[PDB]
Amino acid sequence: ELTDEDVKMITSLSKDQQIGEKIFASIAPSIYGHEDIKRGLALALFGGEPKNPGGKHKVRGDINVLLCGDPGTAKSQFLKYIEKVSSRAIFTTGQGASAVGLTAYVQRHPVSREWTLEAGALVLADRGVCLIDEFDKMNDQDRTSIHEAMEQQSISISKAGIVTSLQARCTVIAAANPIGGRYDPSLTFSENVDLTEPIISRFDILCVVRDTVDPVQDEMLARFVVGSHVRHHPSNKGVEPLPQEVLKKYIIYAKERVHPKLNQMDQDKVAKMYSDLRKESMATGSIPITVRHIESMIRMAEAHARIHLRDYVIEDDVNMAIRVMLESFIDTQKFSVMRSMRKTFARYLSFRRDNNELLLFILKQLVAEQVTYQRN
Amino acid sequence: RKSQLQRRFKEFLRQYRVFTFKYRDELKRHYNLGEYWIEVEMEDLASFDEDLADYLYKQPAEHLQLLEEAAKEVADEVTRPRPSGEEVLQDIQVMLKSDASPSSIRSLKSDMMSHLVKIPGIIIAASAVRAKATRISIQCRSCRNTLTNIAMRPGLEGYALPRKCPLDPYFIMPDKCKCVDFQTLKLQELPDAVPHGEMPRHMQLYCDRYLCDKVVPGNRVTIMGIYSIKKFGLVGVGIRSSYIRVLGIQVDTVSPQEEEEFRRLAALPNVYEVISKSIAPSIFGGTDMKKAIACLLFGGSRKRLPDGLTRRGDINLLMLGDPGTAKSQLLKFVEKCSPIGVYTSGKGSSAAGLTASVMRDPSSRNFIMEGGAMVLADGGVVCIDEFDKMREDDRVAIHEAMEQQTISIAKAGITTTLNSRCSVLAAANSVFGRWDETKGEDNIDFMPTILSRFDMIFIVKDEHNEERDVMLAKHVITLHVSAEGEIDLAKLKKFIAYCRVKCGPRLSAEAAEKLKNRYIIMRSGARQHERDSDRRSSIPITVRQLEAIVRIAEALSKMKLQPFATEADVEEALRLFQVSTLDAALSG
DNA sequence: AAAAAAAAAAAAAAAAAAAAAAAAA
DNA sequence: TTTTTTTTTTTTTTTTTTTTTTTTT
Ligand SMILES: Nc1ncnc2c1ncn2[C@@H]1O[C@H](COP(=O)(O)OP(=O)(O)OP(=O)(O)O)[C@@H](O)[C@H]1O
Ligand SMILES: Nc1ncnc2c1ncn2[C@@H]1O[C@H](COP(=O)(O)OP(=O)(O)O)[C@@H](O)[C@H]1O
Ligand SMILES: [Mg+2]
Ligand SMILES: [Mg+2]
Ligand SMILES: [Zn+2]
Numbered sequence A: 001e002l003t004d005e006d007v008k009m010i011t012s013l014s015k016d017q018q019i020g021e022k023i024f025a026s027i028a029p030s031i032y033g034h035e036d037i038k039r040g041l042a043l044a045l046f047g048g049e050p051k052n053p054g055g056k057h058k059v060r061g062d063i064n065v066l067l068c069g070d071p072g073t074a075k076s077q078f079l080k081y082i083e084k085v086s087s088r089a090i091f092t093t094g095q096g097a098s099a100v101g102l103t104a105y106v107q108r109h110p111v112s113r114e115w116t117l118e119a120g121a122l123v124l125a126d127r128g129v130c131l132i133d134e135f136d137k138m139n140d141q142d143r144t145s146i147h148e149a150m151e152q153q154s155i156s157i158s159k160a161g162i163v164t165s166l167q168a169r170c171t172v173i174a175a176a177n178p179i180g181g182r183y184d185p186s187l188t189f190s191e192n193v194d195l196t197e198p199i200i201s202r203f204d205i206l207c208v209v210r211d212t213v214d215p216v217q218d219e220m221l222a223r224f225v226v227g228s229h230v231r232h233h234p235s236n237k238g239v240e241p242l243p244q245e246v247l248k249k250y251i252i253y254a255k256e257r258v259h260p261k262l263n264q265m266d267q268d269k270v271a272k273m274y275s276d277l278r279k280e281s282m283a284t285g286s287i288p289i290t291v292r293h294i295e296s297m298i299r300m301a302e303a304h305a306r307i308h309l310r311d312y313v314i315e316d317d318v319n320m321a322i323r324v325m326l327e328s329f330i331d332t333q334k335f336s337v338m339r340s341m342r343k344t345f346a347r348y349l350s351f352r353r354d355n356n357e358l359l360l361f362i363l364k365q366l367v368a369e370q371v372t373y374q375r376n
Numbered sequence B: 001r002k003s004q005l006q007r008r009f010k011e012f013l014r015q016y017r018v019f020t021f022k023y024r025d026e027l028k029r030h031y032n033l034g035e036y037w038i039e040v041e042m043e044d045l046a047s048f049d050e051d052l053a054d055y056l057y058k059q060p061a062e063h064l065q066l067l068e069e070a071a072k073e074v075a076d077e078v079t080r081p082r083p084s085g086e087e088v089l090q091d092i093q094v095m096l097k098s099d100a101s102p103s104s105i106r107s108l109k110s111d112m113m114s115h116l117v118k119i120p121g122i123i124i125a126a127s128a129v130r131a132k133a134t135r136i137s138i139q140c141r142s143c144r145n146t147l148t149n150i151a152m153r154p155g156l157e158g159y160a161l162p163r164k165c166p167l168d169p170y171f172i173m174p175d176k177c178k179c180v181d182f183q184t185l186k187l188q189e190l191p192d193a194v195p196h197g198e199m200p201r202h203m204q205l206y207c208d209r210y211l212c213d214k215v216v217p218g219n220r221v222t223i224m225g226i227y228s229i230k231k232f233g234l235v236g237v238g239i240r241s242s243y244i245r246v247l248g249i250q251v252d253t254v255s256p257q258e259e260e261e262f263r264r265l266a267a268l269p270n271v272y273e274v275i276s277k278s279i280a281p282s283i284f285g286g287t288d289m290k291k292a293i294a295c296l297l298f299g300g301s302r303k304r305l306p307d308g309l310t311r312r313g314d315i316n317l318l319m320l321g322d323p324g325t326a327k328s329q330l331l332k333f334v335e336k337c338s339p340i341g342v343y344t345s346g347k348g349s350s351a352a353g354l355t356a357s358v359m360r361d362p363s364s365r366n367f368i369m370e371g372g373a374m375v376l377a378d379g380g381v382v383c384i385d386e387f388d389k390m391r392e393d394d395r396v397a398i399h400e401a402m403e404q405q406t407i408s409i410a411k412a413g414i415t416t417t418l419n420s421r422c423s424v425l426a427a428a429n430s431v432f433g434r435w436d437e438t439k440g441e442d443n444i445d446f447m448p449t450i451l452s453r454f455d456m457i458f459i460v461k462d463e464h465n466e467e468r469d470v471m472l473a474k475h476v477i478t479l480h481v482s483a484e485g486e487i488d489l490a491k492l493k494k495f496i497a498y499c500r501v502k503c504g505p506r507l508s509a510e511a512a513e514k515l516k517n518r519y520i521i522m523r524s525g526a527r528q529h530e531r532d533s534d535r536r537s538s539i540p541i542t543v544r545q546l547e548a549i550v551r552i553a554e555a556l557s558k559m560k561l562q563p564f565a566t567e568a569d570v571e572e573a574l575r576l577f578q579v580s581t582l583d584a585a586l587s588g
Numbered sequence C: 001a002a003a004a005a006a007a008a009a010a011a012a013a014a015a016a017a018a019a020a021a022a023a024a025a
Numbered sequence D: 001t002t003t004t005t006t007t008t009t010t011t012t013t014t015t016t017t018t019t020t021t022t023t024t025t
Helices: A007-015 A019-025 A035-046 A075-085 A140-152 A215-231 A245-257 A266-284 A291-308 A314-329 A336-343 A355-375 B002-015 B022-033 B042-048 B048-056 B060-079 B257-268 B272-276 B287-296 B328-337 B392-404 B448-453 B466-482 B489-502 B509-532 B545-561 B568-585
Strands: A064-071 A089-094 A106-107 A116-120 A129-133 A155-157 A164-166 A171-176 A205-209 B038-043 B095-098 B118-128 B132-136 B137-141 B169-171 B178-180 B182-189 B204-205 B219-229 B243-249 B316-321 B340-343 B355-362 B366-368 B383-384 B406-410 B415-419 B422-429 B458-459
Touching: A007 A019, A007 A245, A019 A035, A019 A291, A019 A314, A035 A064, A035 A089, A035 A171, A035 A205, A035 A245, A035 A291, A035 A314, A035 B118, A064 A075, A064 B366, A075 A089, A075 A245, A075 B328, A116 B182, A116 B219, A140 A171, A140 B328, A140 B340, A155 B340, A164 A314, A164 B137, A171 B422, A171 B489, A205 A314, A215 B287, A215 B392, A266 A291, A266 A314, A266 A336, A266 B466, A291 A314, A291 B466, A314 A336, B002 B022, B002 B038, B002 B048, B002 B060, B002 B466, B022 B038, B022 B287, B042 B316, B060 B095, B060 B219, B060 B545, B118 B243, B118 B458, B204 B219, B257 B272, B257 B458, B257 B489, B272 B545, B287 B316, B287 B328, B287 B422, B287 B545, B328 B340, B328 B383, B328 B422, B392 B406, B448 B458, B458 B568, B489 B545, B509 B568, B545 B568
Parallel strands: A064 A171, A064 A205, A089 A129, A129 A171, B038 B095, B095 B243, B204 B243, B316 B422, B316 B458, B340 B383, B383 B422
Antiparallel strands: A106 A116, A155 A164, B118 B182, B118 B219, B132 B178, B137 B169, B182 B204, B219 B243, B355 B366, B406 B415
């Protein structure tokens, strides 16, 4: 895929001034809705900027994503699309139904009969994407291996005689279901998922996919899937999404060439925002905000800049990264704290969110309240 | 003629300069040291006589033999006068290396057979050193004559005995045949170079006299050798398994000037301060924690009393805190900075257990020791993150190891005591997740016995501050923007190693007196507080804590290479232990 | 305290790579 | 006498079952 004069093509639409919306809408075109999840996956695809000040502070440039949601919401579809669209992308499942496991080992390969070091799946995706379905059904050793990979960005093997440490700088995109098969907003995120706090603490974006009964959305999704079934019958075999091949060409060029530097970030705004969030979160019995959240916001701002190839993070990039990080952090909170932080930080969470979207959301909330009152 | 080529190699060895003749002096020193081998830089050979290097690259098999013979003759010419009993000249293995970038294993097609090839890889298995015969003697069974000095080819190339002096009357005399070292290794392609959806390829390496055991499985290696096939008495037809004849190995990843540098670094009046601020510069705050970690890095002194009992000199540190503080980052730095160090989680690591295990190979019936983080980290540091989530077996194993420094394992085969002299640096979060004072002393589920093991326990909190939050966020943003008194990682690590190997201090009488009085007062205060609370604080103070304070004083005095720990360092160690007694006492 | 599920032990079977001896001409 | 095919043996790995151990009600 080493072409030339396609740098012109990528730059030609790079200046479109709305390419962000195009790319965010050009992820998994077979999945309706879930726009925020698509945005998060785009940011994960383009990635951040790994930096190790001196040689003693290793900071990962990846953006790990965890999609926790009740079943029947196309999480595995997102993971499979990422598998399809991203080079050096591998897919594995918490169950043993995956070709390659998460943990390293050494053995004679069954077909080649040769003694080889089967590196864990995470290692195979050394510079790519590792998709982990059924993230909440892993083994103890699988959990330990994912923890090691996410924490230290490497794997240490001492199985037979191989005392080695080989690095796995992967971006983990995971899919999981809530405990009991249904996500209950009355409980915080960290407690309605079969995952310990340290594991969840290493994910930069948490997407809480909820299947709530809604006649309009239900009808729209039914039309979508039934039309897909019609169009893929054997006999018959607000922007425009980019073609997938051009999308991956753009991803390659951005991920390989442009390395945005945050010399224009407004430290004042970020510091005040962080202090306010700390005070608010501790004012309530809620999971607090920590430094790693600022780290994740920095990574997402760099990734968003990379999407636009700016080479210099701009105020709007920082604001969008803050929007995404605050959306995730708020949705991880319980029901009451959800509204508390929504109202307290509605300004931040409304960046680049036009009036029509908020008005439609509020009207839908009101009509749903009316429906519930009617049918009780 | 081949004699001309050997003469040219002799000239290159004798007269290559750089003034000084590198190879002549290298031969002198190696033969005097008994090494009887040399490392020939390929580029020097090419520059001096490019034809020789080209020949080597095209026909290594015999040109390397010519070079070895020339090196042997030159070594004789430079070190011929020897005492009786060793005057016999010794053959010389000639390892060769070059700066040429290695060629991917996938490019080792058929054409490159018998050429000199440089490839990268990861060695996943190494066989034991064995005997291969370079010179054999065969004696006839009937006439009992001998055919001594039958030249044997190197590499995996056997030899067929003569048929005619009966027919095939010859047998080998083991007592008269000269052999050398021998080893076979398995080299796998580096996982980075393996294509995305693709199996890793393999190759078989064959070492020689001094190349045996220069690597161990797991090393990332660059091999320069002769692509060769087995030669053993000659649906796949005419396929001869291929292997590499190893000639040069490079394993990828203290001078007196540096010793004097360390000496002057220790002599600085504020050496402690510069070391304290030179461990986690990126991490903001926690000066006391950084001082304690420096003390742990330098460690105390191991003492073996005349009765044989051993007092561990390695400090054990624990850090309980909210999941926000940069403590896993601190552990990562510590493992990256300690001379010998390993990072691991409570439940071991990824396919790398925490504590050692012993299993007997049912086929070979050996005693395979699968080394955990503890035994691998002998003489160094083990950084255990999520130290509160161990497994019962591992909990007991560390219970024994942290105090005795030894892991005792007795399996159906044998009993043994592996030596694990590791300093444990543990990180953990509260039982509930966030430290709440309302349940003070109930935020730790550790049994009292384990908490006795740790020399110091630090408690971190984020319960409230605005100025600190602003400063922290701005500092992190500044670090990501940028991306003096700071001893770089390599220099600091080498200084730590030099101090640990060289200086082992001891307490002075006055220091012992002061520490005695202070410890007595601490014990009295802890007992009184426990009585007042009418409950036992799950953070005891014992004579083990006295040992901990003594060890911290020893580490502080070892930083300065001072043989004796003074009163000031004992006071500083008492302050450091006070910053944990703040959790022993003020917590309740 | 007792049952259910998981893990490890252990024993039997298969591949196979190579060295030596008996039968054939 | 000289080849050849077998014979073994010597390692190693793999698979099934059983037994032993760990977790839950
Ligand atoms: N938003 C959507 N757009 C299009 N198709 C969808 C959407 N949500 C669900 N589907 C379809 O509904 C079916 C269920 O989705 P899918 O099988 O991916 O479930 P899932 O979210 O992975 O569930 P689980 O957690 O049980 O594995 C699929 O056929 C999928 O194509
Ligand atoms: N005082 C600090 N100085 C610099 N960075 C910090 C500080 N505290 C937290 N961080 C950042 O916050 C992140 C969380 O740190 P980490 O050690 O992962 O927490 P934990 O040990 O609880 O997992 C780290 O990436 C680190 O860079
Ligand atoms: Mg699924
Ligand atoms: Mg941690
Ligand atoms: Zn004879």
